[PDB]
Protein backbone atom coordinates (compact mmCIF):
# COMPACT_ATOMS: atom_id res chain seq x y z
CA UNK A 1 0.00 0.00 0.00
CA UNK A 2 3.03 2.17 0.78
CA UNK A 3 1.67 5.07 -1.25
CA UNK A 4 -1.24 5.83 1.07
CA UNK A 5 1.00 4.82 3.97
CA UNK A 6 3.72 7.40 3.29
CA UNK A 7 1.07 10.06 2.77
CA UNK A 8 2.12 12.94 5.02
CA UNK A 9 3.92 16.27 5.53
CA UNK A 10 7.60 16.32 4.78
CA UNK A 11 10.42 18.23 6.47
CA UNK A 12 12.90 15.74 4.92
CA UNK A 13 12.80 17.79 1.71
CA UNK A 14 15.17 15.70 -0.40
CA UNK A 15 16.89 17.09 -3.48
CA UNK A 16 17.28 14.66 -6.38
CA UNK A 17 21.05 14.46 -5.90
CA UNK A 18 20.60 13.17 -2.37
CA UNK A 19 17.99 10.70 -3.63
CA UNK A 20 20.56 9.21 -5.99
CA UNK A 21 23.44 9.06 -3.51
CA UNK A 22 21.31 7.15 -1.01
CA UNK A 23 20.10 4.90 -3.81
CA UNK A 24 23.71 4.09 -4.56
CA UNK A 25 24.75 3.42 -0.96
CA UNK A 26 21.73 1.24 -0.16
CA UNK A 27 22.64 -0.96 -3.12
CA UNK A 28 26.46 -0.82 -2.95
CA UNK A 29 26.09 -4.21 -1.30
CA UNK A 30 24.05 -4.46 1.88
CA UNK A 31 25.74 -6.85 4.29
CA UNK A 32 29.11 -5.08 4.39
CA UNK A 33 30.69 -3.62 7.52
CA UNK A 34 30.63 -0.14 9.11
CA UNK A 35 30.28 1.97 5.98
CA UNK A 36 31.94 5.19 7.15
CA UNK A 37 29.86 6.91 9.83
CA UNK A 38 30.38 10.52 8.81
CA UNK A 39 28.91 9.84 5.38
CA UNK A 40 25.75 8.15 6.52
CA UNK A 41 25.63 10.80 9.22
CA UNK A 42 26.07 13.63 6.74
CA UNK A 43 23.75 11.95 4.21
CA UNK A 44 21.12 11.59 6.95
CA UNK A 45 21.80 15.30 7.45
CA UNK A 46 21.37 16.46 3.88
CA UNK A 47 18.10 14.56 3.57
CA UNK A 48 16.30 11.22 3.68
CA UNK A 49 13.70 10.49 0.96
CA UNK A 50 10.39 9.25 2.36
CA UNK A 51 10.20 6.60 -0.38
CA UNK A 52 13.42 4.98 0.83
CA UNK A 53 13.29 6.12 4.46
CA UNK A 54 11.94 2.65 5.12
CA UNK A 55 15.00 0.82 3.86
CA UNK A 56 17.41 3.37 5.28
CA UNK A 57 16.23 2.85 8.84
CA UNK A 58 16.61 -0.91 8.57
CA UNK A 59 20.02 -0.33 6.95
CA UNK A 60 21.16 1.98 9.75
CA UNK A 61 20.01 -0.67 12.17
CA UNK A 62 22.15 -3.23 10.38
CA UNK A 63 25.25 -1.07 10.72
CA UNK A 64 24.62 -0.34 14.39
CA UNK A 65 24.10 -4.12 14.61
CA UNK A 66 27.69 -4.88 13.46
CA UNK A 67 29.26 -1.93 15.24
CA UNK A 68 27.83 -3.21 18.51
CA UNK A 69 26.01 -6.48 19.45
CA UNK A 70 23.81 -7.27 22.45
CA UNK A 71 25.00 -9.51 25.36
CA UNK A 72 22.75 -12.58 24.79
CA UNK A 73 21.31 -12.03 28.27
CA UNK A 74 19.34 -8.88 27.55
CA UNK A 75 18.75 -10.38 24.10
CA UNK A 76 15.03 -10.86 23.31
CA UNK A 77 13.83 -14.44 23.64
CA UNK A 78 13.90 -16.55 20.48
CA UNK A 79 10.40 -16.83 18.98
CA UNK A 80 9.12 -16.24 15.43
CA UNK A 81 6.91 -13.20 14.85
CA UNK A 82 4.33 -15.58 13.37
CA UNK A 83 4.58 -18.10 16.19
CA UNK A 84 4.51 -15.13 18.58
CA UNK A 85 1.00 -14.26 17.42
CA UNK A 86 -0.29 -17.77 18.03
CA UNK A 87 -0.63 -17.07 21.74
CA UNK A 88 -3.25 -15.02 23.54
CA UNK A 89 -2.26 -11.57 24.81
CA UNK A 90 -3.19 -10.39 28.28
CA UNK A 91 -3.27 -6.80 27.04
CA UNK A 92 -6.14 -7.18 24.52
CA UNK A 93 -8.60 -4.68 25.97
CA UNK A 94 -5.95 -2.06 26.47
CA UNK A 95 -4.46 -2.65 22.99
CA UNK A 96 -7.73 -2.55 21.06
CA UNK A 97 -9.09 0.46 22.86
CA UNK A 98 -5.95 2.31 21.69
CA UNK A 99 -5.96 1.26 18.03
CA UNK A 100 -8.33 4.06 17.14
CA UNK A 101 -6.44 6.72 19.10
CA UNK A 102 -3.06 6.17 17.41
CA UNK A 103 -2.61 8.34 14.31
CA UNK A 104 -6.43 8.48 13.86
CA UNK A 105 -6.53 11.13 11.15
CA UNK A 106 -4.09 9.10 9.10
CA UNK A 107 -5.66 7.31 6.12
CA UNK A 108 -4.07 3.96 6.83
CA UNK A 109 -5.07 3.95 10.52
CA UNK A 110 -8.40 5.71 9.98
CA UNK A 111 -10.72 2.86 8.95
CA UNK A 112 -12.36 1.21 11.95
CA UNK A 113 -10.57 -2.08 12.64
CA UNK A 114 -9.20 -1.99 9.10
CA UNK A 115 -5.94 -3.45 7.68
CA UNK A 116 -3.89 -0.72 9.32
CA UNK A 117 -5.44 -0.92 12.76
CA UNK A 118 -5.08 -4.64 12.24
CA UNK A 119 -1.33 -4.74 11.69
CA UNK A 120 -0.77 -2.13 14.38
CA UNK A 121 -2.59 -4.57 16.65
CA UNK A 122 -0.53 -7.65 15.78
CA UNK A 123 2.68 -5.62 16.37
CA UNK A 124 1.50 -4.35 19.73
CA UNK A 125 0.06 -7.80 20.49
CA UNK A 126 3.14 -9.80 19.64
CA UNK A 127 5.56 -7.44 21.37
CA UNK A 128 3.30 -7.61 24.41
CA UNK A 129 3.97 -11.35 24.54
CA UNK A 130 7.68 -11.37 23.77
CA UNK A 131 8.70 -8.56 26.14
CA UNK A 132 6.32 -9.81 28.86
CA UNK A 133 7.86 -7.48 31.46
CA UNK A 134 6.76 -4.39 29.55
CA UNK A 135 3.77 -6.06 27.97
CA UNK A 136 1.84 -3.13 26.59
CA UNK A 137 2.16 0.53 27.41
CA UNK A 138 0.10 3.40 26.06
CA UNK A 139 2.38 4.82 23.35
CA UNK A 140 4.67 1.99 22.29
CA UNK A 141 1.98 1.84 19.55
CA UNK A 142 3.00 5.31 18.08
CA UNK A 143 6.45 3.88 17.84
CA UNK A 144 5.16 0.68 16.29
CA UNK A 145 2.88 2.83 14.17
CA UNK A 146 5.51 5.10 12.67
CA UNK A 147 7.42 1.91 11.85
CA UNK A 148 4.47 0.15 10.30
CA UNK A 149 4.06 3.25 8.17
CA UNK A 150 7.38 2.77 6.38
CA UNK A 151 7.64 -1.02 5.99
CA UNK A 152 6.02 -4.48 5.94
CA UNK A 153 4.30 -5.60 9.13
CA UNK A 154 6.95 -8.27 9.61
CA UNK A 155 9.87 -5.93 8.89
CA UNK A 156 8.41 -3.43 11.30
CA UNK A 157 8.27 -5.99 14.07
CA UNK A 158 11.95 -6.49 13.41
CA UNK A 159 12.93 -2.83 13.83
CA UNK A 160 10.57 -2.52 16.75
CA UNK A 161 12.57 -5.27 18.48
CA UNK A 162 15.79 -3.53 17.62
CA UNK A 163 14.60 -0.11 18.73
CA UNK A 164 13.20 -1.48 21.99
CA UNK A 165 15.97 -3.95 22.84
CA UNK A 166 19.16 -3.28 20.87
CA UNK A 167 18.91 0.50 21.02
CA UNK A 168 17.53 -0.17 24.45
CA UNK A 169 14.26 1.81 24.50
CA UNK A 170 12.09 -0.76 26.23
CA UNK A 171 13.67 0.71 29.35
CA UNK A 172 11.47 3.78 29.95
CA UNK A 173 8.40 1.70 29.29
CA UNK A 174 9.03 -0.62 32.20
CA UNK A 175 6.37 -0.62 35.03
CA UNK A 176 8.47 0.71 37.91
CA UNK A 177 8.95 3.96 35.89
CA UNK A 178 12.43 4.11 37.41
CA UNK A 179 14.23 4.77 34.17
CA UNK A 180 11.67 7.41 33.18
CA UNK A 181 12.22 9.34 36.40
CA UNK A 182 15.93 9.47 35.62
CA UNK A 183 15.59 10.49 31.98
CA UNK A 184 13.45 13.27 33.40
CA UNK A 185 16.11 14.44 35.87
CA UNK A 186 18.67 14.25 33.08
CA UNK A 187 16.58 16.61 30.97
CA UNK A 188 16.30 18.82 34.01
CA UNK A 189 20.03 18.92 34.67
CA UNK A 190 20.62 19.33 30.94
CA UNK A 191 18.56 22.51 30.78
CA UNK A 192 20.34 23.86 33.83
CA UNK A 193 23.83 23.30 32.37
CA UNK A 194 23.01 25.10 29.10
CA UNK A 195 19.87 27.17 29.41
CA UNK A 196 20.06 28.42 32.98
CA UNK A 197 17.62 31.34 32.74
CA UNK A 198 15.10 28.99 31.14
CA UNK A 199 15.74 26.40 33.82
CA UNK A 200 15.41 28.90 36.65
CA UNK A 201 12.17 30.25 35.24
CA UNK A 202 10.78 26.71 35.21
CA UNK A 203 12.23 25.85 38.63
CA UNK A 204 10.69 28.96 40.15
CA UNK A 205 7.18 28.06 38.97
CA UNK A 206 7.74 24.44 40.02
CA UNK A 207 7.44 23.05 36.49
CA UNK A 208 9.00 19.58 36.54
CA UNK A 209 9.93 17.90 33.23
CA UNK A 210 7.43 15.16 34.11
CA UNK A 211 4.60 17.60 33.42
CA UNK A 212 5.63 18.31 29.85
CA UNK A 213 8.13 15.76 28.57
CA UNK A 214 6.92 12.33 29.67
CA UNK A 215 4.74 12.32 26.53
CA UNK A 216 7.65 13.45 24.38
CA UNK A 217 9.77 10.53 25.58
CA UNK A 218 7.14 7.83 25.80
CA UNK A 219 5.81 8.50 22.34
CA UNK A 220 8.99 9.84 20.84
CA UNK A 221 7.14 13.07 19.97
CA UNK A 222 4.57 11.25 17.84
CA UNK A 223 1.67 11.87 20.24
CA UNK A 224 2.03 15.62 19.69
CA UNK A 225 4.08 16.58 16.63
CA UNK A 226 3.91 16.37 12.86
CA UNK A 227 4.50 12.81 11.56
CA UNK A 228 6.96 14.19 9.02
CA UNK A 229 8.78 15.70 11.98
CA UNK A 230 8.53 12.50 13.93
CA UNK A 231 9.85 10.76 10.82
CA UNK A 232 13.03 12.86 10.91
CA UNK A 233 13.56 12.46 14.60
CA UNK A 234 13.43 8.78 13.71
CA UNK A 235 16.17 9.12 11.08
CA UNK A 236 18.55 10.17 13.84
CA UNK A 237 17.03 7.73 16.33
CA UNK A 238 18.32 4.98 14.07
CA UNK A 239 21.71 6.60 13.97
CA UNK A 240 22.77 8.17 17.22
CA UNK A 241 20.50 6.41 19.77
CA UNK A 242 18.71 6.63 23.21
CA UNK A 243 19.42 10.36 23.31
CA UNK A 244 18.40 12.04 20.10
CA UNK A 245 15.35 12.42 22.36
CA UNK A 246 17.15 14.80 24.72
CA UNK A 247 18.71 16.68 21.81
CA UNK A 248 15.27 17.28 20.33
CA UNK A 249 13.65 18.17 23.65
CA UNK A 250 16.51 20.45 24.51
CA UNK A 251 16.69 22.04 21.08
CA UNK A 252 12.93 22.43 20.93
CA UNK A 253 12.57 24.00 24.37
CA UNK A 254 15.15 26.63 23.51
CA UNK A 255 13.82 26.97 20.01
CA UNK A 256 10.79 28.89 21.14
CA UNK A 257 12.15 29.50 24.70
CA UNK A 258 12.06 33.16 23.76
CA UNK A 259 8.46 32.63 24.55
CA UNK A 260 7.66 30.72 27.72
CA UNK A 261 9.28 33.52 29.70
CA UNK A 262 6.37 35.95 29.03
CA UNK A 263 4.00 33.53 30.77
CA UNK A 264 4.04 33.65 34.59
CA UNK A 265 1.47 31.10 35.82
CA UNK A 266 1.80 27.37 35.18
CA UNK A 267 -1.64 27.55 33.58
CA UNK A 268 -0.28 30.08 31.06
CA UNK A 269 3.18 28.52 30.72
CA UNK A 270 2.16 24.84 30.71
CA UNK A 271 -0.73 25.31 28.25
CA UNK A 272 1.81 26.92 25.91
CA UNK A 273 4.56 24.28 26.03
CA UNK A 274 2.10 21.43 25.68
CA UNK A 275 -0.54 22.84 23.36
CA UNK A 276 1.32 25.59 21.48
CA UNK A 277 5.00 24.67 21.32
CA UNK A 278 4.18 21.67 19.06
CA UNK A 279 2.19 23.61 16.47
CA UNK A 280 5.23 24.81 14.56
CA UNK A 281 5.50 25.68 10.87
CA UNK A 282 8.05 23.87 8.68
CA UNK A 283 10.46 26.83 8.84
CA UNK A 284 10.78 26.37 12.60
CA UNK A 285 10.97 22.61 12.25
CA UNK A 286 13.48 22.65 9.41
CA UNK A 287 15.84 24.31 11.88
CA UNK A 288 15.18 22.42 15.11
CA UNK A 289 15.75 19.17 13.23
CA UNK A 290 19.11 20.35 11.95
CA UNK A 291 20.09 21.92 15.30
CA UNK A 292 19.68 18.50 16.85
CA UNK A 293 21.92 17.08 14.12
CA UNK A 294 24.84 19.33 14.98
CA UNK A 295 23.87 19.82 18.58
CA UNK A 296 26.69 18.55 20.70
CA UNK A 297 27.01 17.39 24.24
UniProtKB/Swiss-Prot annotation:
Annotated organism of origin: Homo sapiens (Human)
Positions spanned in the full protein: 874 to 1168 of 1298
Record keywords: Acetylation, Cytoplasm, Diabetes mellitus, GTPase activation, Methylation, Phosphoprotein, Repeat
Post-translational modification: Phosphorylated by AKT1; insulin-induced. Also phosphorylated by AMPK in response to insulin. Insulin-stimulated phosphorylation is required for SLC2A4/GLUT4 translocation. Has no effect on SLC2A4/GLUT4 internalization. Physiological hyperinsulinemia increases phosphorylation in skeletal muscle. Insulin-stimulated phosphorylation is reduced by 39% in type 2 diabetic patients.
Physiological role: May act as a GTPase-activating protein for RAB2A, RAB8A, RAB10 and RAB14. Isoform 2 promotes insulin-induced glucose transporter SLC2A4/GLUT4 translocation at the plasma membrane, thus increasing glucose uptake.
Cellular component GO terms, alphabetical: cytosol; Golgi apparatus; vesicle
Subcellular locations according to the entry: Cytoplasm
Protein name: TBC1 domain family member 4
Domain Rab-GAP TBC: 47-241
Tissue specificity remark: Widely expressed. Isoform 2 is the highest overexpressed in most tissues. Isoform 1 is highly expressed in skeletal muscle and heart, but was not detectable in the liver nor in adipose tissue. Isoform 2 is strongly expressed in adrenal and thyroid gland, and also in lung, kidney, colon, brain and adipose tissue. Isoform 2 is moderately expressed in skeletal muscle. Expressed in pancreatic Langerhans islets, including beta cells (at protein level). Expression is decreased by twofold in pancreatic islets in type 2 diabetes patients compared to control subjects.
GO biological process terms, semicolon-separated: cellular response to insulin stimulus; negative regulation of vesicle fusion; vesicle-mediated transport
Taxonomic superkingdom: Eukaryota
Annotated disease: Type 2 diabetes mellitus 5: A multifactorial disorder of glucose homeostasis caused by a lack of sensitivity to insulin. Affected individuals usually have an obese body habitus and manifestations of a metabolic syndrome characterized by diabetes, insulin resistance, hypertension and hypertriglyceridemia. The disease results in long-term complications that affect the eyes, kidneys, nerves, and blood vessels.
Gene Ontology molecular functions: GTPase activator activity
Amino acid sequence: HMKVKLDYEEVGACQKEVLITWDKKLLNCRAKIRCDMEDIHTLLKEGVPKSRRGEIWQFLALQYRLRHRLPNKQQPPDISYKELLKQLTAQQHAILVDLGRTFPTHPYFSVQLGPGQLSLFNLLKAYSLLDKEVGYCQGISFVAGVLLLHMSEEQAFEMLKFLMYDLGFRKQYRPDMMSLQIQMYQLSRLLHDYHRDLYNHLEENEISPSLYAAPWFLTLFASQFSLGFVARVFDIIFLQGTEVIFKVALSLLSSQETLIMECESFENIVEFLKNTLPDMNTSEMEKIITQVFEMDI
